[PDB]
């Protein structure tokens, strides 16, 4: 008795009708640029892992960002490269400028067009109600695009949203966990950051889709309008689901598990307990009340749902009343 199959409600077959070269990253041949074009200027507080630097293109004195990919699984590298190249020029997507490698160590690096290195996490506490809606809308522009291009980001979080507030420009970055969506395909659930993992990842449901990014976006929104970062603050993957269940309730969780015939890790039995669904108004207080509205709560309610199929798509999200003034001002 295995799990019930699932399909994305939107963009389900975008990759099936595209040439093979588009999504078949393993057959992609990487073309190397000249590493001598670039010199490191200063290290950036990023993943602190596969390390990222501010750099300069000394051939034209343009500022760039360099991401050295150490260690080196070759398959994961080609995936990120292919996705970056596929999405290049798209709305609010970071631009891959070049690909180089150390002639000696053979260690590859990506070179990105320069982006103002303030992340949504640094920016949000100073933003008004309107600005949050504005930037949330901008993020939806990027997600709807990448989803329409048959790609799920799978690592949506404040750290991966670069914002130049001066020029009101936004870029979605770090596509190292991103993947092509193919209807019916089972994916690895060990993706995203713990605080932004969807219930599908936590209960080990592999046939997930773009809607994973929408849960992550919901976590971001909740943390910002309620001023509680991160909103679901688990100490591990197991506790993470517990933190969610204390808000969304255990009844809908078990409805979700039943609906898709999911086999829950038996270790959840003694930790999950029984919890009522909490009204969103419970998280509202004097310090955050200026960021909360009936529209924000309704919008949030339609993102943070166990059932990935029931969550708003990126496109449906952009049509929500929460963004009415933003859309009207854009025209």
């Amino acid at each position: 008795s295995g799990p019930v199959p699932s399909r994305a409600r939107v963009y389900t077959d975008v990759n099936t009708h595209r040439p093979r070269e588009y999504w078949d990253y393993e057959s992609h041949v990487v073309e190397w640029g000249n590493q001598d074009d670039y010199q490191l200027v200063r290290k950036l507080g990023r993943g602190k892992y596969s390390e990222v630097f501010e750099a300069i293109n000394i051939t034209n004195n343009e500022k760039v960002v360099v991401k050295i990919l150490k260690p080196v699984k070759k398959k994961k590298i080609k995936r990120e490269i292919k996705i970056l190249e596929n999405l290049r020029g798209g709305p609010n997507i970071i631009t891959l400028a070049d690909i180089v490698k150390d002639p000696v160590s053979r260690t590859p690096a990506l070179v990105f067009e320069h982006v103002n290195n303030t992340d949504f996490k640094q920016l949000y506490q100073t933003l008004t109600d309107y600005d949050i809606r504005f930037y949330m809308y901008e993020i939806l522009k990027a997600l709807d695009y990448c989803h329409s291009m048959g790609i799920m980001h799978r690592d949506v979080k404040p750290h991966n949203v670069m914002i130049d507030h001066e020029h009101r420009k936004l870029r979605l970055i770090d596509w190292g966990l991103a993947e092509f969506y193919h209807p019916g395909q089972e994916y690895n659930v060990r993706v995203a950051s713990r605080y932004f993992k969807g219930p599908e990842l936590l209960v080990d449901y592999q046939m997930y889709d773009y809607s994973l990014d929408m849960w992550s976006l919901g976590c971001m929104l909740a943390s910002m309008i309620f001023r509680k970062e991160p909103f679901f603050h688990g100490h591990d993957n197991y506790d993470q689901l517990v933190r969610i269940a204390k808000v969304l309730g255990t009844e809908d969780l078990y409805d979700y598990i039943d609906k898709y015939n999911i086999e829950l890790d038996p270790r959840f039995n003694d930790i999950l307990g029984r919890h009522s669904r909490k009204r969103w108004e419970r998280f509202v207080h004097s310090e955050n009340q200026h960021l909360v509205s009936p529209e924000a709560l309704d919008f949030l309610d339609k993102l943070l749902r166990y059932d990935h199929q029931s969550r708003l798509t990126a496109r449906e999200a952009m049509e929500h009343p929460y963004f009415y003034t933003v859309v009207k001002d854009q025209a």
Binding site: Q35, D36, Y38, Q39, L40, V41, F53, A55, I56, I58, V66, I68, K70, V100, K101, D102, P103, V104, S105, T107, A109
Partner: peptide
């Protein structure tokens, strides 16, 4: 030692 994974460090040595 002004090289880091092949890259020269800007302004080094």
């Amino acid at each position: 030692g002004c090289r880091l994974y092949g890259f020269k460090i800007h302004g080094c040595g």
